[PDB]
Design a protein around this ligand. Structure first.
Ligand SMILES: Nc1nc2ncc(CO)nc2c(=O)[nH]1
Ligand SMILES: Nc1nc2ncc(CO)nc2c(=O)[nH]1
Lengths: 244, 258
């Protein structure tokens, strides 16, 4: 029942020049987003990724906008280390110990996401997820990163396997991750394919299956939420809180 | 938390509206009904009221003329029909048509039609409304007494108690005060226990939702869905909505998520 901070998804490439992604990043802030999750990915490339970030990064910092960057490459990550973005989203969970001490000299909060790319007993995935967090958080702490800087993401959708039951189990049991490590947790359900396998609808185009899962996560204590339609979630969270 | 029926709103007057001519497209309303049903609607809430207040005998026979083809066609396909009208002459036409529900936003205040309502097998949607700056607490108390007096006067005439569905009213029907709508939304389970009757919640696209967020809720679904979700988990028996598919798809997520 805690107020969740919204993460606005802005993809730099599919929106673009830089201005179409910039104006998409301020319209979401004008809609109730606390942090803008910047993504700039194409096909097949470190300089190409960074070149699209620099104009959007410092433009949002010129207006005091908290920025999250979705990158799994350490060279792109070390760039975000010294640009001093407020968040750095890694869908791989920092598996390369090269930049470990590099992440300790910084202060940007780290987001530790877990995935399991093939046979899914849905609870066995949860247990190994508990052990994955226990080993990766410790090694990050041993490298100098403060424990108060890690945010856990249990993964969702195709990051948990083609089985929709796996994503349902984690959506019901993510409070257990909250109290086992005493740390914040973000849930990302927006337009993920497994929502269509439950309702039989055209995902990526239907907001309501998506909205129902984000309110459920908010009502169970999710600290952060990652979505596309921000003004829809912002109004869903305003109604949900005022309604008791 | 449990079951919930969905009322599909079909404004026959709106589906036959004015793009440069009025109330001759009697098939758009019929297609809007059959559409909403394959989106997950349980009952079709037909509404053929005039665009502006009309209280003559012509507006009566005009309301039946807009309901007569839509009611008939939906009957041939086994569709639960609910008529959204507050006129006694229109309601008597719905009784002889064997319509499933009669949705009255005035709470049936005319005793002349009580005789016709007793013989009917249709269910009744008794709605409560407000006088016209009343404190939200006193609106709830007067609503309780209003249901208590009107339910008795209906069973006195011969309407079996179990056919009465209670609607507390929402938004402008409770006043321009948003907290009055919030109080009813978070305290309506007290209605189902005091009267042991079903309760219908109708929040779809009401102005008070915009006063809480600050967005145009008349054409948007997110605040309508958030409020419709809360009433579902709180045990609302029926749900009157516009976007049936978005609510039906939403109910399929909460049922899987538990
Ligand atoms: N933290 C987090 N980030 C993501 N980035 C991209 C995508 C692709 O949908 N998913 C996610 C996600 O599920 N969680
Ligand atoms: N049963 C019921 N019917 C309504 N009809 C029209 C309108 C106006 O939107 N409201 C309602 C309502 O709140 N409850």
């Amino acid at each position: 029942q805690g107020m969740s901070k919204i993460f606005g998804i802005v993809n730099i490439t599919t929106d673009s020049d830089t201005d179409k992604a910039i104006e998409h990043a301020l319209h979401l802030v004008e809609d109730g987003a606390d942090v803008i999750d910047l993504g700039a990915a194409s096909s097949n490339g470190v300089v190409e990724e960074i070149k699209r970030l620099k104009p959007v990064i410092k433009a949002l910092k010129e207006k005091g906008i908290s920025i999250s960057v979705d990158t799994f490459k350490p060279e792109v990550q070390s760039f975000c280390i010294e640009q001093k973005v407020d968040f750095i989203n890694d869908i791989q969970g920092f598996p390369y110990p090269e930049i470990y001490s590099g992440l300790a000299k910084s202060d940007c909060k780290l987001v530790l996401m877990h995935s399991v790319q093939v046979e899914t007993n849905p609870e066995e995935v949860f247990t190994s997820m508990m052990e994955f967090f226990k080993e990766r958080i410790a090694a990050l702490v041993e490298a100098g990163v403060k424990r108060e800087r890690i945010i856990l993401d249990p993964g969702m959708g195709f990051f948990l396997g083609s089985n929709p039951e796996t994503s349902i189990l984690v959506l019901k049991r993510f409070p257990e991750i909250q109290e086992a490590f005493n740390l914040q947790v973000m849930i990302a359900v927006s337009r993920k394919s497994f929502l269509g396998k439950i309702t039989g609808t055209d995902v990526k185009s239907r907001l309501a299956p998506t909205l129902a899962a984000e309110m459920y996560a908010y009502k169970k204590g999710a600290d952060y939420l990652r979505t596309h339609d921000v003004k829809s979630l912002s109004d869903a969270l305003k109604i949900s809180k005022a309604l008791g």
